[PDB]
Amino acid sequence: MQRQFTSMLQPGVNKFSLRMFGSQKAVEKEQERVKTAGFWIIHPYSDFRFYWDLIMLIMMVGNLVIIPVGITFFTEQTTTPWIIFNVASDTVCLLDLIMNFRTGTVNEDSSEIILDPKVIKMNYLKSWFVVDFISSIPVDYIFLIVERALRIVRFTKILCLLRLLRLSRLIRYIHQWEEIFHMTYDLASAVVRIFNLIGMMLLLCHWDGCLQFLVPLLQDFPPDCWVSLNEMVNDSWGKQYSYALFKAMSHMLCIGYGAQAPVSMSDLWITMLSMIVGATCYAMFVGHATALIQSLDSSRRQYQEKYKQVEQYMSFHKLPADMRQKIHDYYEHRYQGKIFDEENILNELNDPLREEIVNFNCRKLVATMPLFANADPNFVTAMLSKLRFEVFQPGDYIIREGAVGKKMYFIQHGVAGVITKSSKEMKLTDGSYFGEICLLTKGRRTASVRADTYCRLYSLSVDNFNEVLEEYPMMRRAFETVAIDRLDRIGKKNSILLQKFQKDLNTGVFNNQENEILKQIVKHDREMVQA
Amino acid sequence: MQRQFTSMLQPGVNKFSLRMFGSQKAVEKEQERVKTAGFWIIHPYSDFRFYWDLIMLIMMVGNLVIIPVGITFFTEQTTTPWIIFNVASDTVCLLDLIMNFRTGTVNEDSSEIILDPKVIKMNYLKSWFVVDFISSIPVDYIFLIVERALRIVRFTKILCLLRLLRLSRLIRYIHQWEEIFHMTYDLASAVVRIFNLIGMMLLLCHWDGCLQFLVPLLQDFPPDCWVSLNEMVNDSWGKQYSYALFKAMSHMLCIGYGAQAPVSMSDLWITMLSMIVGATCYAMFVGHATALIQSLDSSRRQYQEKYKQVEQYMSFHKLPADMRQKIHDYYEHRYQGKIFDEENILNELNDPLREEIVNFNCRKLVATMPLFANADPNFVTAMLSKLRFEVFQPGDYIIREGAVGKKMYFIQHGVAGVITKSSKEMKLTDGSYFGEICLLTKGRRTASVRADTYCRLYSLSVDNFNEVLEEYPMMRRAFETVAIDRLDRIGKKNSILLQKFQKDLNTGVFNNQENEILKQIVKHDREMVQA
Amino acid sequence: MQRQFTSMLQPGVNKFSLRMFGSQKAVEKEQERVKTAGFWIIHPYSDFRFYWDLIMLIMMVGNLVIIPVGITFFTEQTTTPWIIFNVASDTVCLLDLIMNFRTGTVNEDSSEIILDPKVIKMNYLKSWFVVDFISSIPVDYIFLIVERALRIVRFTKILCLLRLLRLSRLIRYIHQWEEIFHMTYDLASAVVRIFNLIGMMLLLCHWDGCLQFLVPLLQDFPPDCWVSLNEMVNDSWGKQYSYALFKAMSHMLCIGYGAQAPVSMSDLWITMLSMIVGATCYAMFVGHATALIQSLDSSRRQYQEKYKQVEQYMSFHKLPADMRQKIHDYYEHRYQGKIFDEENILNELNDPLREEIVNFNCRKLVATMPLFANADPNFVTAMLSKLRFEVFQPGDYIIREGAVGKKMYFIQHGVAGVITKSSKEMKLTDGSYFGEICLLTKGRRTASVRADTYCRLYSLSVDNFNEVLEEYPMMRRAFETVAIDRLDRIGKKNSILLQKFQKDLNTGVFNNQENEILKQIVKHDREMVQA
Ligand SMILES: Nc1ncnc2c1ncn2[C@@H]1O[C@@H]2COP(=O)(O)O[C@H]2[C@H]1O
Ligand SMILES: Nc1ncnc2c1ncn2[C@@H]1O[C@@H]2COP(=O)(O)O[C@H]2[C@H]1O
Ligand SMILES: Nc1ncnc2c1ncn2[C@@H]1O[C@@H]2COP(=O)(O)O[C@H]2[C@H]1O
Ligand SMILES: [Hg+2]
Ligand SMILES: [Hg+2]
Ligand SMILES: [Hg+2]
């Protein structure tokens, strides 16, 4: 009852209300501000106002369709459907006139003033009251009591379009909804938009044909108008309307005239005006179609543009053909036909979303790799936030022996081969890491690592490595243990790292459980290398 | 009198003058340079020249409309309006010829040379004097005294279009004004531009129809021209002009011919030429309409493109559906359907504008938060310039206990919950800050902070924090006091911070008023937490 | 046999399979997962499914072409080609109906579920089974046994288009292939795309003309239809079809009607509908043509835009004309009409590709320059990765004497002149370097270096220089030796560097072979300067 009424009048919490007023607490405060009126008032964001604008829109469309047909072909309409439609439109327009008093205006620059007592009424009386009044003047059944004549009277109903001109915030909300829909579905959105355009053009053709038959009627059908020429002055209204609409549509779409070219001044000038209007609207239609298509094929176009820029670079530097093919298939394997700026996206997001994304991306790595499978989640999240994606092609040398290292790698996909001066070549696969002994000893690379298949790795710089491990030293002890074991395995040895770990162990800092965990890690690594 | 004359001739201070000559002092110097002439001279930026170009434009439009109609349908015109229009156009063209002497040219590469005595006269005598002279030759009433004939004479008046070709700087100023208008109003600008295009095309149709009726007239209406075919050789000039314009417009908009297809060579070739011209101009019209629409829907298109790139990223990484929905609603709540680069904007602005903007943005924070409500404005502006906006979703963990902290947060909207190992959970709301104890003690986070509703915060890094507080130490004392109180409240204690503050207090650096203010701050914080 | 069958059903390793499933090991795992069915099943990426979709596409095109002609002009077809085509289409549609059971669906969000036993059958029974069944219902030869009539029956065959609506993954693969082709060949791609569009429009014209002749046939040719008006009710089917297609095509391309304008209600409304459809499709065609052209001229447009921005900058700063010409010819010589972001490209690539590219770019430098011609490849690759391209114009001063230096240069093309206070001017050419004595002594520049012709150099910063040389000191000794020799040559001397090298030599760190190599380097440099 009154509770539902007040709820309808008060701005309901919705996505549009949140977008316009920030927090939900502000929505509650605005509900309270509406409550401060005491006298009934509808908020420009009320669901009641939304539904009312909806029914007013459907009534305006019905009127736009029906008014010209009546004016032209129906002199007097006293049948049931005509009377009920006229009275329905009259009462609806009057109710809208009334309710436009208690409507809170919404000015720009974040200006929304209820101003129930006087400001809204005064602004409406000064702005648009007279046109809505003459619209709401009832059907000619009341004008005959107050005072071709009928055809002259009904003209006053053409200005009901101004209500549709005012009804635009609902149009903007519908445009937002349709934009969401278009981003969701591609082809359906195109179909809907082109059908909307076709509907607009068809309504214009309707009005044009109505006018083209109306004007020869206001002159009692002179002997040289197209009606008297085609001798269809006595045909039923169906044929007359059909042929008039045909003439109007042929003038719009630039097909031709009707039977023949005009011969009288009246229909001559009407034909010229209709030709101008139709040509302009068809140009607008072509423009909208071009815009729709160009918006449809955006991503493919951007991909082609990036590809062309890469081609221009390779051409400017005059690279060999095989190298160009290598660059192209590398791009194909890295981006897989897609285009985006991952750095910009990750910068736009926030910390919890980035953590969620990297955890989902490296779920399998966290599951398989032992250190992550047993470490504290804060350290895991730090490492995963510091990682960075990379792709390597078969035969490429990921690490060259002797050089200075500045990053380590975590394998996500593929197989990598480790080659030394000895014949012992060891092949790592998913869930294993390499290139950390250089980062742990500050020396040079101790072995060469070459990609055997297409490898997909996650590299970690040396600065981030040192930062994270300075924040967590026990993981550094674990890394050093695994690295010493690997070095002992290949047949080389780093006395610096060995003596450092031996001193740390003799210092008694580690516990029995600690060295047990370290033995578990080294066993797991031995298994992962043997497999 | 002479004062107003000199003021009109001298470049008036306006937005265009400022844009062209930098400082207002340069405008005064150019006024002086004009004064150095001694002989009267109009500056190419004078309001007098502006008004003169305006009236010359309206006269050129009147001539473009009237000349062909006269030439074609009016053999001799001795009535009052015709005579007055001819003499008006003649005197106006002659006055423009005269005033083009004392006009200072404006070359490119910042070249504006008054050069009153000789250079302007010589350049005009060498450039365009003869065509303007033959234009300014008076109406045929003087040519008959000097020496179909009339129709041959009036041709000399067609070259008045060259004056309109010269009048282009006023066109550029009008284009600037219309660009401002178009940036201001959207739909009105589109209506104005399409009406301008339609007017151009209609003027072309006018000239085309005039020619199409003129040529059969110069041949005494042969029996096979369209005029003699339609037997309208004797009709009043109204009907002839109407039907000729109809033929021209049907040829342009590609509807058809007139009554029937041409049958004679003359009108055959004229029809082909008119068809070519009309098709070209309609193609140009379609192009302009497409450009206008595509410029109308720019921002929506850019928003759609960014959304599509985010979608492509999420697809390349194969994220779950709920995570994709979370990303999308986060974007919706962060940007609210708008698109801009805040970093680039703030980099484009300057320091006072940035200070103004951040002060307006954080007005409520400065009002509510006690430290800012009592501190020195320089410190307040430093902090507000260092802040950075952020958005969090409900349930997200803003701060996880035990981790290392690198920023603090100031709440602008929403509610945040503080959870510890104890059951004491404390809820902060607008105007409160958290996450500073880690920055003050260089330890770890002492509690977990989780967003309860959609939170909108302003984060401050640790480097900027330390910089600002090294510039202002008393605020650091206040922060430390509030932090010690909060720690004591939750039930934990940091002996390092406690002993540091105790030593600073025993050092006698603080005053009675100082500790009074600190007690006020701690009381206000207790109230803000209790509420 | 069965081996080839299982191979066809299992997803073959291809570029699309790799793009959809990452590593080849995943492709093998999916082959195994298909093997887990036990009951035969085709994978949505099987080459068998590809070939089947191909033959179904050709059958659908044949049906789209043949069905309307039959329905309209061929009452009963009992000849050999008609019967064989009908039975072929029937069996093909039935086989597709059958095979759509064992087809694994492919949902979005990385969802590919074989689900052989029940899920696929249930989903197909709930989704699209009935329409495919009524399609697969055989030709009317079976419907007559089961129960104008013929023309009523064959309508059931129009819904075979739904199969073409389903066949879209093959369309996407063909679109990928055509995108590769379009990136490869420019003009051929445009020709193919416009021919595709023309084919679509022609098929639509075909259906439209078929309908336009069909409707007057279903009414026994009333006396006022266009057929009875043109008296072609008795002509052979060739002429009737030709004239109907002519009417439809004239309605689409907006030429006109047929003989004359319609006179009856039926063909009146059919003409209006056909006009609407044709205008819409021609608008779509114009849109696609505009998009194709705009995609064709992309790179030229981007180059023009960058040029215009440079022009706007130079205009805003009001630079002289000769300076503007200098800027423009510098741009012409630096980028050579091409446009790309080398930094972004090199950031997108990886380390081995970057090493390959820089090695190919500086091959001649490595060949000619002695230090690189004798040094270790790791040092060479470090230097080449640190270098950076630069271009200088004739007369420009590359290095001014006395100033502080922050980079050295390696000449790739051109000649440079070295000027001192003495008259000894020495000219360096390709393969020589300069500007290292400042970097080695931390003093000031010891001579001026001016470009004589258009120079193309590779500059190396001072930080990278010091980093690389701290990683490799012997090369620093070589640089110092060459620099001391050059200084002694010009007539100046740096006692600091001289004494440092003398102390290093007296320290006995160098070997006989080492100083032999150094003598070789200094001899080679003397030769390169003398030449
Ligand atoms: N036995 C081994 N098994 C697996 N990986 C190894 C082995 N020995 C060395 N590596 C890795 O190969 C890398 C080569 O360079 P680094 O010495 O920087 O670090 C080395 C380790 O990451
Ligand atoms: N009693 C409290 N009331 C409000 N906020 C608190 C309280 N105790 C701790 N906090 C905040 O919670 C944060 C958790 O991490 P920090 O220790 O970095 O800094 C802490 C303070 O900002
Ligand atoms: N005799 C020479 N031959 C070639 N180049 C020289 C000679 N003397 C000096 N240079 C170069 O000219 C440079 C001028 O500045 P720098 O002293 O930094 O380093 C100097 C050398 O690179
Ligand atoms: Hg109305
Ligand atoms: Hg003139
Ligand atoms: Hg079929």
From Swiss-Prot, chains A, B, C:
GO terms for biological process: apical protein localization; cellular response to cAMP; cellular response to interferon-beta; general adaptation syndrome, behavioral process; maternal behavior; negative regulation of action potential; negative regulation of synaptic transmission, glutamatergic; neuronal action potential. Changing I171T: Found in a patient with childhood focal epilepsy; uncertain significance. GO terms for cellular component: apical dendrite; axon; axon terminus; basolateral plasma membrane; cell surface; dendrite; dendrite membrane; dendritic shaft. Residues 72-80, 215-240, 263-267 are extracellular. GO terms for molecular function: cAMP binding; identical protein binding; intracellular cAMP-activated cation channel activity involved in regulation of presynaptic membrane potential; intracellularly cAMP-activated cation channel activity; phosphatidylinositol-3,4,5-trisphosphate binding; phosphatidylinositol-4,5-bisphosphate binding; potassium channel activity; voltage-gated monoatomic cation channel activity. Changing M201L: In DEE24; absence of hyperpolarization-activated currents; highly reduced amount of protein at the cell membrane. The chain crosses the membrane at residues 50-71, 81-101, 123-143, 157-177, 192-214, 268-288. Residues 102-122, 178-191 are cytoplasmic. It is found in: Cell membrane. Activated by cAMP, and at 10-100 times higher concentrations, also by cGMP. cAMP binding promotes tetramerization and formation of an active channel. Compared to other family members, cAMP has less stimulatory effect on HCN1 because part of the molecules already contain bound cAMP and form homotetramers when cAMP levels are low, this inherent tetramerization in HCN1 results in a weaker response to increased cAMP. Inhibited by Cs(1+), zatebradine, capsazepine and ZD7288. Changing T79P: In GEFSP10; uncertain significance. The keyword Signal does not apply. A motif (Selectivity filter) lies at residues 254-258. It catalyses: Na(+)(in) = Na(+)(out); K(+)(in) = K(+)(out). The keyword Cell membrane applies. Residues 241-262 dip into the membrane without crossing it. Changing G287C: In GEFSP10; affects channel gating properties as the half-activation voltage is shifted to the hyperpolarizing direction. The segment S4 is probably the voltage-sensor and is characterized by a series of positively charged amino acids at every third position. This is Potassium/sodium hyperpolarization-activated cyclic nucleotide-gated channel 1. It comes from Homo sapiens (Human). The gene is HCN1.
